[PDB]
Paper text:
The hypothetical protein ORF6 of the Enc34 phage is conserved among all Nazgul-like phages and consists of a single domain, currently annotated as a domain of an unknown function DUF2815. Here, we present structural and functional characterization of the Enc34 ORF6 that allows us to establish its function as a single-stranded DNA-binding protein (SSB) and extend this annotation to other DUF2815 family members. The SSBs are ubiquitous within all kingdoms of life and in DNA viruses, and protect ssDNA intermediates during replication, repair and recombination. In this study, we show that the Enc34 ORF6 is structurally homologous to the gene 2.5 protein from bacteriophage T7, and present a high-resolution structure of ORF6 in complex with ssDNA, which reveals for the first time the structural basis for the ssDNA-binding mechanism of T7-type SSBs.
Residue numbers in the entry: 2 to 38, 44 to 97, 101 to 188
Write the structure that this text describes.
């Protein structure tokens, strides 16, 4: 089965399957080469509030549908347990940004700027560094288990869009190393 668009907006697409393409967002903390924290592949997407209002509205609507249609009944989920956070409230590079966390245990497809699929972890890590711009396909899902109630986003694919200043390495919290 293929993706079928339901609604297209500036900087994104909602598909009939519930998948969401988020376009032209800045990446942070990429873990596409190897899984990180059951370890999962992940990425953080920084959506500028000025340019991504329409796709953020879709994301909010899909989050609410995901809560409502949860299998055991409509699920009450705290704002801090959603895959989208507010960069101005909840967190410097996040200022004026919506902050999306998407994860998957299955390696997402990773495409370079020429839309070639990258297979090698070293090339994946070199191409998609924190600070570059990407587009991504995600899909919301609801979690209700012993670890809590969340609305999460599966990470299906990432496309590199453009280079920009790297955020650097030095952004890992080292404060728990001796515990
Ligand atoms: Cl980063
Ligand atoms: Mg938009």
């Amino acid at each position: 089965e293929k993706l079928v668009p339901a609604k297209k907006v500036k900087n994104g697409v909602l598909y009939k399957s519930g998948h969401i393409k988020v376009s032209n967002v800045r990446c942070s903390y990429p873990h596409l080469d190897k899984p990180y924290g059951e370890p999962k592949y992940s990425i953080t997407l920084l959506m500028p509030k000025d340019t991504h209002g329409a796709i953020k509205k879709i994301i909010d609507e899909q989050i609410e549908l995901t809560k409502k249609n949860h299998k055991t009944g409509a699920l009450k989920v705290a704002p801090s347990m959603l895959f989208i956070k507010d960069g101005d409230v909840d967190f410097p590079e996040c200022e004026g940004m919506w902050v999306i966390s998407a994860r998957e245990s299955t390696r997402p497809d990773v495409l370079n700027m020429e839309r070639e699929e990258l297979e090698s972890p070293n090339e994946i890590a070199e191409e998609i560094y924190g600070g570059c711009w990407v587009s991504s396909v995600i899909r919301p899902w609801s979690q209700e288990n012993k670890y809590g109630k969340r609305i999460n986003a599966n990470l299906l694919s990432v496309l590199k869009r453009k280079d920009d200043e790297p955020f650097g390495e030095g952004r890992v919290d080292t404060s728990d190393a001796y515990d």
